[PDB]
Ligand binder design. Structure first.
Ligand SMILES: [Zn+2]
Ligand SMILES: [Zn+2]
Ligand SMILES: [Zn+2]
Ligand SMILES: [Zn+2]
Ligand SMILES: [Zn+2]
Ligand SMILES: [Zn+2]
Length: 168
DNA sequence: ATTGCAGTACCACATTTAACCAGCAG
DNA sequence: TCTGCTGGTTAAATGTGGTACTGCAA
């Protein structure tokens, strides 16, 4: 199918689309009257505001918040007020978590320890991350953390680092 | 010197979603 | 030709999560 584009030899089925390629490469508007976005093609602006800016009859709720919105753009934009913010406040105590998983663990301290070692009568509140009890006690290598140059060893980086600050 | 615990930092992997783009009917 | 739609394709942001790390207080 013709017709080849002269500067760059597309490759287009119909002339109108080819001239569209000359316009795109080979720029253009358009700016959504309501939001600050810009769209390549006008028809794509059409879809943008048939999807972001149509009145939704039953409002949607924020994932983190109690705000409802009847506009999609308004809804997402709001969820912005929640990004990189502590979005999971805790009812019993004033601790807040950016991620829910953490909120669940914190809860456990208030609502008491369902992780249990197979080999021992030990229950760990947090997730497996405390089944590293398993590595230490049911014992397949603690980390060295060597200082320089005194060559001393520490079981923890931070302590070693502090020591390294003033050593000879 | 240390460790366990609660909670954070870091960094990688999986998901979503909104514009792109070609082609099309009217 | 011209205009407005589409469905499927493409990446950037964000959710998800593993884990090493930390600060605190035994
Ligand atoms: Zn060209
Ligand atoms: Zn808009
Ligand atoms: Zn909200
Ligand atoms: Zn709490
Ligand atoms: Zn055990
Ligand atoms: Zn040293």
């Amino acid at each position: 199918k013709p017709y080849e584009c002269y500067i760059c030899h597309a490759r287009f089925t119909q002339s109108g689309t080819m001239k569209m390629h000359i316009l795109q490469k080979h720029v253009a508007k358009f700016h959504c009257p309501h939001c600050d976005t810009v769209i390549a093609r006008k028809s794509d602006l059409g879809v943008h505001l048939r999807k972001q800016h149509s009145y939704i009859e039953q409002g949607k709720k924020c994932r983190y918040c109690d705000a409802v919105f009847h506009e999609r753009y308004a809804l997402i934009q709001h969820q912005k007020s929640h990004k990189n913010e502590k979005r999971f406040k805790c009812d019993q105590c004033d601790y807040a978590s950016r991620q829910e998983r953490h909120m669940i663990m914190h809860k456990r301290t208030h609502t008491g320890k369902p992780y249990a070692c197979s080999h021992c009568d030990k229950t760990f509140r947090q997730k497996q991350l405390l089944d590293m009890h398993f590595k230490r006690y049911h014992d397949p290598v603690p980390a060295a953390f060597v200082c320089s140059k005194c060559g001393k060893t520490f079981t923890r980086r931070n302590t070693m680092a502090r020591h390294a600050d003033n050593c000879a």
